[PDB]
Protein backbone atom coordinates (compact mmCIF):
# COMPACT_ATOMS: atom_id res chain seq x y z
CA UNK A 1 0.00 0.00 0.00
CA UNK A 2 1.81 3.10 -1.29
CA UNK A 3 -1.48 5.05 -1.41
CA UNK A 4 -4.89 4.69 0.28
CA UNK A 5 -8.28 5.12 -1.42
CA UNK A 6 -10.69 6.70 1.07
CA UNK A 7 -14.14 7.30 -0.38
CA UNK A 8 -17.25 8.75 1.26
CA UNK A 9 -19.67 6.23 2.74
CA UNK A 10 -21.85 8.22 5.14
CA UNK A 11 -22.70 11.80 6.06
CA UNK A 12 -23.97 12.40 9.59
CA UNK A 13 -26.35 15.34 10.10
CA UNK A 14 -27.82 16.49 13.41
CA UNK A 15 -25.98 19.31 15.18
CA UNK A 16 -27.60 22.74 14.84
CA UNK A 17 -24.25 24.50 15.35
CA UNK A 18 -20.55 23.98 14.56
CA UNK A 19 -19.06 20.59 15.43
CA UNK A 20 -15.98 20.69 17.66
CA UNK A 21 -14.60 17.15 17.90
CA UNK A 22 -15.18 13.51 16.94
CA UNK A 23 -13.74 10.37 18.58
CA UNK A 24 -13.93 6.60 17.99
CA UNK A 25 -14.63 4.23 20.90
CA UNK A 26 -11.77 1.83 21.75
CA UNK A 27 -13.96 -1.26 21.25
CA UNK A 28 -14.65 0.02 17.74
CA UNK A 29 -18.45 0.14 17.95
CA UNK A 30 -19.27 3.83 18.31
CA UNK A 31 -18.44 7.37 17.24
CA UNK A 32 -18.91 10.34 19.59
CA UNK A 33 -19.23 14.03 18.72
CA UNK A 34 -19.26 17.36 20.55
CA UNK A 35 -20.61 20.68 19.29
CA UNK A 36 -21.18 24.38 19.95
CA UNK A 37 -24.87 23.53 20.44
CA UNK A 38 -24.12 22.25 23.97
CA UNK A 39 -24.84 18.68 22.81
CA UNK A 40 -23.04 15.33 22.65
CA UNK A 41 -24.22 12.73 20.12
CA UNK A 42 -23.43 9.03 19.58
CA UNK A 43 -23.33 7.34 16.15
CA UNK A 44 -22.80 3.83 14.79
CA UNK A 45 -19.17 3.56 13.70
CA UNK A 46 -19.85 1.15 10.82
CA UNK A 47 -23.28 2.30 9.62
CA UNK A 48 -23.23 5.98 10.58
CA UNK A 49 -26.61 5.51 12.23
CA UNK A 50 -27.72 7.92 14.95
CA UNK A 51 -27.94 6.43 18.44
CA UNK A 52 -28.64 9.05 21.13
CA UNK A 53 -28.15 12.61 22.38
CA UNK A 54 -26.54 13.49 25.72
CA UNK A 55 -27.23 16.88 27.33
CA UNK A 56 -26.24 18.91 30.39
CA UNK A 57 -23.70 21.67 29.74
CA UNK A 58 -24.88 25.28 29.91
CA UNK A 59 -22.65 26.51 27.08
CA UNK A 60 -20.80 25.10 24.07
CA UNK A 61 -18.55 22.03 24.14
CA UNK A 62 -15.10 21.99 22.54
CA UNK A 63 -13.93 18.42 23.15
CA UNK A 64 -14.86 14.88 24.21
CA UNK A 65 -12.94 11.67 25.05
CA UNK A 66 -13.63 7.95 25.58
CA UNK A 67 -12.54 5.80 28.51
CA UNK A 68 -10.62 2.61 27.70
CA UNK A 69 -13.57 0.24 28.14
CA UNK A 70 -15.85 2.34 25.90
CA UNK A 71 -18.27 2.89 28.80
CA UNK A 72 -17.58 6.46 29.91
CA UNK A 73 -17.07 9.91 28.38
CA UNK A 74 -15.44 13.14 29.53
CA UNK A 75 -16.28 16.52 27.94
CA UNK A 76 -14.84 20.05 28.09
CA UNK A 77 -17.12 23.10 27.87
CA UNK A 78 -17.26 26.90 27.81
CA UNK A 79 -19.05 26.82 31.16
CA UNK A 80 -15.65 26.41 32.85
CA UNK A 81 -16.48 22.79 33.72
CA UNK A 82 -15.88 19.19 32.68
CA UNK A 83 -18.46 16.40 32.89
CA UNK A 84 -18.12 12.62 33.14
CA UNK A 85 -20.90 10.60 31.48
CA UNK A 86 -22.17 7.04 31.67
CA UNK A 87 -22.79 6.35 27.98
CA UNK A 88 -25.45 3.64 28.42
CA UNK A 89 -27.67 5.50 30.90
CA UNK A 90 -26.77 8.97 29.67
CA UNK A 91 -26.32 10.09 33.27
CA UNK A 92 -23.80 12.71 34.38
CA UNK A 93 -21.62 10.97 36.99
CA UNK A 94 -19.40 13.91 37.98
CA UNK A 95 -18.93 17.62 37.30
CA UNK A 96 -15.29 18.71 37.47
CA UNK A 97 -15.17 22.30 38.75
CA UNK A 98 -11.88 24.20 38.95
CA UNK A 99 -10.85 26.21 35.89
CA UNK A 100 -11.65 29.94 35.85
CA UNK A 101 -12.31 30.16 32.11
CA UNK A 102 -13.21 28.04 29.06
CA UNK A 103 -12.21 24.38 29.18
CA UNK A 104 -10.98 23.43 25.73
CA UNK A 105 -9.42 19.94 25.69
CA UNK A 106 -9.57 16.63 27.61
CA UNK A 107 -8.46 12.97 27.72
CA UNK A 108 -8.51 9.77 29.78
CA UNK A 109 -5.27 8.05 30.75
CA UNK A 110 -4.72 4.45 29.54
CA UNK A 111 -5.82 3.13 32.95
CA UNK A 112 -8.77 5.57 32.75
CA UNK A 113 -8.66 6.43 36.45
CA UNK A 114 -7.30 9.90 35.68
CA UNK A 115 -8.39 12.78 33.44
CA UNK A 116 -6.25 15.66 32.15
CA UNK A 117 -7.61 19.00 30.87
CA UNK A 118 -6.47 22.29 29.32
CA UNK A 119 -8.11 25.71 29.61
CA UNK A 120 -8.15 29.36 28.53
CA UNK A 121 -6.97 30.20 32.06
CA UNK A 122 -3.55 29.01 30.83
CA UNK A 123 -3.46 25.99 33.17
CA UNK A 124 -3.52 22.18 33.09
CA UNK A 125 -5.41 20.17 35.73
CA UNK A 126 -5.27 16.48 36.66
CA UNK A 127 -8.55 14.98 37.92
CA UNK A 128 -9.52 11.77 39.71
CA UNK A 129 -12.31 9.93 37.89
CA UNK A 130 -14.03 8.16 40.79
CA UNK A 131 -14.05 11.07 43.24
CA UNK A 132 -14.30 13.81 40.61
CA UNK A 133 -11.92 16.03 42.56
CA UNK A 134 -8.84 17.82 41.22
CA UNK A 135 -5.45 16.35 42.16
CA UNK A 136 -2.94 18.73 40.55
CA UNK A 137 -2.92 22.20 39.01
CA UNK A 138 0.01 22.82 36.68
CA UNK A 139 1.12 26.40 35.85
CA UNK A 140 1.79 25.09 32.36
CA UNK A 141 1.61 28.12 30.08
CA UNK A 142 1.26 31.88 29.63
CA UNK A 143 -1.44 31.62 26.95
CA UNK A 144 -4.52 29.41 26.37
CA UNK A 145 -3.84 25.64 26.28
CA UNK A 146 -4.63 23.96 22.97
CA UNK A 147 -4.10 20.24 23.67
CA UNK A 148 -3.33 17.66 26.36
CA UNK A 149 -2.49 13.95 25.98
CA UNK A 150 -1.31 10.92 27.99
CA UNK A 151 1.42 8.62 26.70
CA UNK A 152 1.08 4.85 26.31
CA UNK A 153 1.48 3.86 29.98
CA UNK A 154 0.11 7.11 31.40
CA UNK A 155 3.37 8.17 33.05
CA UNK A 156 3.74 11.29 30.89
CA UNK A 157 1.54 14.19 29.76
CA UNK A 158 2.22 16.47 26.79
CA UNK A 159 0.69 19.94 26.34
CA UNK A 160 0.71 22.80 23.83
CA UNK A 161 -0.30 26.47 23.81
CA UNK A 162 -0.55 29.71 21.84
CA UNK A 163 2.59 30.84 23.67
CA UNK A 164 4.57 28.65 21.27
CA UNK A 165 5.61 25.91 23.69
CA UNK A 166 5.38 22.14 24.04
CA UNK A 167 6.00 20.67 27.50
CA UNK A 168 6.35 17.15 28.92
CA UNK A 169 4.93 16.52 32.39
CA UNK A 170 5.51 13.63 34.78
CA UNK A 171 2.05 12.43 35.81
CA UNK A 172 2.96 11.25 39.30
CA UNK A 173 4.93 14.32 40.40
CA UNK A 174 3.48 17.04 38.17
CA UNK A 175 6.95 18.34 37.33
CA UNK A 176 7.92 19.89 33.99
CA UNK A 177 10.41 17.48 32.42
CA UNK A 178 10.91 19.13 29.03
CA UNK A 179 10.22 22.25 26.95
CA UNK A 180 10.40 22.15 23.14
CA UNK A 181 11.67 25.26 21.36
CA UNK A 182 12.06 25.41 17.57
CA UNK A 183 14.08 27.88 15.48
CA UNK A 184 11.09 30.17 15.94
CA UNK A 185 7.97 29.98 18.11
CA UNK A 186 4.62 30.38 16.33
CA UNK A 187 1.46 29.40 18.29
CA UNK A 188 1.13 25.63 18.75
CA UNK A 189 -2.45 24.63 17.93
CA UNK A 190 -2.21 20.87 18.50
CA UNK A 191 -0.05 18.12 20.01
CA UNK A 192 -0.19 14.39 20.91
CA UNK A 193 2.05 11.35 21.48
CA UNK A 194 2.86 8.64 18.96
CA UNK A 195 1.46 5.09 19.45
CA UNK A 196 4.90 3.77 20.46
CA UNK A 197 5.36 6.82 22.67
CA UNK A 198 8.70 7.80 21.15
CA UNK A 199 7.42 10.86 19.28
CA UNK A 200 5.00 13.76 19.43
CA UNK A 201 3.07 15.31 16.54
CA UNK A 202 2.76 19.09 16.70
CA UNK A 203 0.92 21.67 14.61
CA UNK A 204 1.57 25.41 14.41
CA UNK A 205 -0.42 28.29 12.93
CA UNK A 206 1.92 28.69 9.98
CA UNK A 207 0.39 25.84 7.96
CA UNK A 208 2.87 23.28 9.29
CA UNK A 209 2.85 19.90 11.06
CA UNK A 210 5.95 18.31 12.62
CA UNK A 211 7.14 15.01 14.11
CA UNK A 212 9.38 15.46 17.15
CA UNK A 213 11.76 13.18 18.98
CA UNK A 214 11.02 14.86 22.29
CA UNK A 215 13.68 13.10 24.38
CA UNK A 216 16.45 14.20 22.01
CA UNK A 217 14.63 17.44 21.18
CA UNK A 218 14.88 17.31 17.39
CA UNK A 219 12.40 17.46 14.51
CA UNK A 220 12.32 14.34 12.35
CA UNK A 221 9.55 14.99 9.83
CA UNK A 222 7.65 17.98 8.40
CA UNK A 223 4.25 17.98 6.66
CA UNK A 224 2.84 20.88 4.63
CA UNK A 225 0.38 21.75 1.87
CA UNK A 226 -2.75 22.38 3.92
CA UNK A 227 -4.00 25.65 5.41
CA UNK A 228 -3.94 26.33 9.16
CA UNK A 229 -3.54 29.84 10.58
CA UNK A 230 -6.57 30.42 12.81
CA UNK A 231 -7.99 27.19 14.22
CA UNK A 232 -6.75 24.40 16.47
CA UNK A 233 -7.11 21.40 14.15
CA UNK A 234 -6.81 17.80 15.34
CA UNK A 235 -4.25 15.41 13.82
CA UNK A 236 -3.89 11.61 13.93
CA UNK A 237 -1.66 8.59 13.39
CA UNK A 238 -3.21 6.08 10.99
CA UNK A 239 -1.97 2.58 11.84
CA UNK A 240 -4.59 0.02 10.74
CA UNK A 241 -3.45 -0.25 7.12
CA UNK A 242 -0.81 2.04 5.69
CA UNK A 243 1.15 4.32 8.01
CA UNK A 244 -0.23 7.80 7.34
CA UNK A 245 -0.73 11.18 8.97
CA UNK A 246 -4.26 12.59 8.99
CA UNK A 247 -5.39 16.19 9.54
CA UNK A 248 -8.09 18.71 8.72
CA UNK A 249 -7.52 22.03 6.98
CA UNK A 250 -8.97 25.53 6.66
CA UNK A 251 -9.63 24.95 2.95
CA UNK A 252 -12.42 22.43 3.65
CA UNK A 253 -10.33 19.33 2.89
CA UNK A 254 -8.91 16.29 4.68
CA UNK A 255 -5.18 15.87 4.02
CA UNK A 256 -3.44 12.48 4.18
CA UNK A 257 0.37 12.21 4.27
CA UNK A 258 2.80 9.33 3.86
CA UNK A 259 4.50 9.32 7.28
CA UNK A 260 8.01 8.59 5.98
CA UNK A 261 8.19 10.36 2.61
CA UNK A 262 6.10 13.31 3.85
CA UNK A 263 4.17 13.20 0.55
CA UNK A 264 0.49 14.07 0.21
CA UNK A 265 -1.14 10.83 -0.91
CA UNK A 266 -4.84 11.76 -0.81
CA UNK A 267 -7.08 14.79 -0.30
CA UNK A 268 -10.75 14.27 0.57
CA UNK A 269 -13.45 16.59 -0.79
CA UNK A 270 -17.01 17.06 0.45
CA UNK A 271 -17.24 19.65 3.23
CA UNK A 272 -18.34 23.27 2.74
CA UNK A 273 -16.50 24.82 5.71
CA UNK A 274 -13.30 24.38 7.74
CA UNK A 275 -12.56 20.79 8.73
CA UNK A 276 -11.81 21.06 12.44
CA UNK A 277 -11.53 17.44 13.55
CA UNK A 278 -10.56 13.97 12.31
CA UNK A 279 -10.23 10.52 13.86
CA UNK A 280 -9.05 7.03 12.88
CA UNK A 281 -10.86 3.76 13.67
CA UNK A 282 -8.89 1.41 16.00
CA UNK A 283 -9.14 -1.78 13.87
CA UNK A 284 -10.56 -0.75 10.48
CA UNK A 285 -9.41 1.63 7.73
CA UNK A 286 -12.11 4.20 8.47
CA UNK A 287 -11.74 7.97 8.96
CA UNK A 288 -14.23 10.37 10.54
CA UNK A 289 -14.36 14.13 9.93
CA UNK A 290 -16.41 17.14 11.08
CA UNK A 291 -16.82 20.77 10.03
CA UNK A 292 -17.63 24.25 11.37
CA UNK A 293 -20.66 26.57 11.47
CA UNK A 294 -21.47 26.79 7.74
CA UNK A 295 -21.41 23.00 7.36
CA UNK A 296 -22.34 21.25 10.63
CA UNK A 297 -21.93 17.76 9.13
CA UNK A 298 -19.87 14.69 10.07
CA UNK A 299 -18.51 12.32 7.40
CA UNK A 300 -17.36 8.68 7.37
CA UNK A 301 -14.83 7.61 4.74
CA UNK A 302 -13.58 4.07 4.08
CA UNK A 303 -10.50 2.63 2.37
CA UNK A 304 -9.45 -0.80 1.11
CA UNK A 305 -5.96 -0.36 2.58
Ligand SMILES: O=C(NCc1cc(Cl)cc(Cl)c1)c1cccc(Cn2ccnc2)c1
Pocket residue numbers: 019020021062063104105144145146147162230231232233234276277
Ligand atom coordinates in the same frame (compact mmCIF):
# COMPACT_ATOMS: atom_id res chain seq x y z
O1 LIG B 1 -9.61 26.98 17.03
C1 LIG B 1 -10.51 27.13 17.78
N1 LIG B 1 -10.73 28.41 18.42
C2 LIG B 1 -9.83 29.51 18.12
C3 LIG B 1 -8.95 29.75 19.35
C4 LIG B 1 -8.50 28.57 20.19
C5 LIG B 1 -7.62 28.81 21.42
CL1 LIG B 1 -7.08 27.43 22.42
C6 LIG B 1 -7.21 30.23 21.80
C7 LIG B 1 -7.67 31.41 20.95
CL2 LIG B 1 -7.18 33.07 21.38
C8 LIG B 1 -8.54 31.17 19.72
C9 LIG B 1 -11.44 25.96 18.07
C10 LIG B 1 -12.86 26.23 18.58
C11 LIG B 1 -13.79 25.07 18.88
C12 LIG B 1 -13.30 23.64 18.67
C13 LIG B 1 -11.88 23.37 18.17
C14 LIG B 1 -11.40 21.94 17.96
N2 LIG B 1 -10.58 21.52 19.08
C15 LIG B 1 -9.27 21.42 19.09
C16 LIG B 1 -8.89 20.99 20.32
N3 LIG B 1 -9.97 20.83 21.05
C17 LIG B 1 -11.03 21.16 20.30
C18 LIG B 1 -10.95 24.54 17.86
